[PDB]
Amino acid sequence: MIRIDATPYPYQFHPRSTALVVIDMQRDFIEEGGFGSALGNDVRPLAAIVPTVAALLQLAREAGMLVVHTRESHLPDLSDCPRSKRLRGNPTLGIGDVGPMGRILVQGEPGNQILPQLAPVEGELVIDKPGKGAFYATDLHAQLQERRITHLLVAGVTTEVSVQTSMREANDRGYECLVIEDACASYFPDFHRITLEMLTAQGGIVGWRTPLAQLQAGV
Amino acid sequence: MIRIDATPYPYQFHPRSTALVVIDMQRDFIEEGGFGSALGNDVRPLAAIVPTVAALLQLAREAGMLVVHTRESHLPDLSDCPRSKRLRGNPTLGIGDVGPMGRILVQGEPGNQILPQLAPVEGELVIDKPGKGAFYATDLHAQLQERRITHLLVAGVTTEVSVQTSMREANDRGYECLVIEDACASYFPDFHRITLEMLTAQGGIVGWRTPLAQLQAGV
DSSP states (O other): OEEEOOBSSOEEEOGGGEEEEEEOOBHHHHSTTSHHHHTTOOOHHHHHTHHHHHHHHHHHHHHTOEEEEEEEOBOTTOTTSOHHHHHTTOOSSOTTSEEBTEETTBTTSGGGSBOGGGOOOTTOEEEEESSSSTTTTSSHHHHHHHTTOOEEEEEEEOIIIIIHHHHHHHHHTTOEEEEEEEEEEOSOTTTHHHHHHHHHHHHHSSOEEEOHHHHHHHO | OEEEOOBSSOEEEOGGGEEEEEEOOBHHHHSTTSHHHHTTOOOGGGGGGHHHHHHHHHHHHHHTOEEEEEEEOBOTTOTTSOHHHHHSSOOSSOTTSEETTEETTBTTOGGGSBOGGGOOOTTOEEEEESSSSTTTTSSHHHHHHHTTOOEEEEEEEOIIIIIHHHHHHHHHTTOEEEEEEEEEEOSSHHHHHHHHHHHTHHHHSSOEEEOHHHHHHHO
16 A cells, blocks of 8 residues: 555555546636636636646556546537526526537537547546536446545646535545645636645545645655 | 525525525534534634524525425444544544544434524424535435425535535536525634635636525515
């Protein structure tokens, strides 16, 4: 079992009982021409972690861990998109409308694809999720139980939305979760660090956090 | 049909399709010597909201809305308590250990009870949940769908753990959620404030928030 330095105390895991979960690293959220920048978000902090996420993905692949990618996406007919989600924020361009990289948040559109630097390969799970939490309305929990996974390494975007939602759901379902702090990012510096602090408060209420360099030291 | 001034924009609901959800207002969180104290917290800040939660409960009862209470709790044999949750951190006492109000976080124990001043009455729904999120491993989604509930008024403790986890689950499931800002509290004032900001960021990404006085004005 590999033991690495973490907050709030060291985290130990066996690589073959562990999955890396890379959350929502999608072109529309991260690329300068994309829908995220069009809404006036500063995508630079999300772009900034891509080399770190790629290094974590390489570590996981070399260590023989299960790799799980998630995409926030809906069926082209929006049959899995609740009306509340479509109407939220009174948007000019909403879910299913044509944005700069195709229909917004729709399966098969260029904007919906994982960045090519972090693209899934054969033997990796890819989860299309209709919400922020990777476990809601997906078979992720079943797929991890079939593979006897107990431990999750968590990366991706954005820290305070899909990453924290997915880690809080994983914690509730009995997973031991380690969030890789420099392999996550937010549009808001107001939210990134304090989220990671929340997750590991009270002796690890949701789980653990560490930088990629501490994980690399262990393998 | 009832329109409330709220952040990030006004919230509209109908009592016939709205529930009040009161989260984890238990002696295990609010009274010294239970689960919250066992985690090393000073539980004293949560008591300050109990009169505001009581006024919110009265308002919902007088409006004839469905009321849902949640209790974080485990079966006495701990068969619904993941090993990860039991072994997390270094608590003074662990789940199921005997504290001054009985077995910590166990169903039927004095310290696990909802505060008498906030107790359920005949015709309210009471959800025992094994995780922080009110939807995981409960029938809450089915119970609301059977009553055609679309809107949730949300209150309780703690803001950054059970409240925000439950609200994020409810958002993913298509509910429209209004958190009553002064009917929530945290052990950590900064986590309370920033959680409320995250929930309504980006045009209402999780939902809405407003103080009790704005709700009272609308009814």
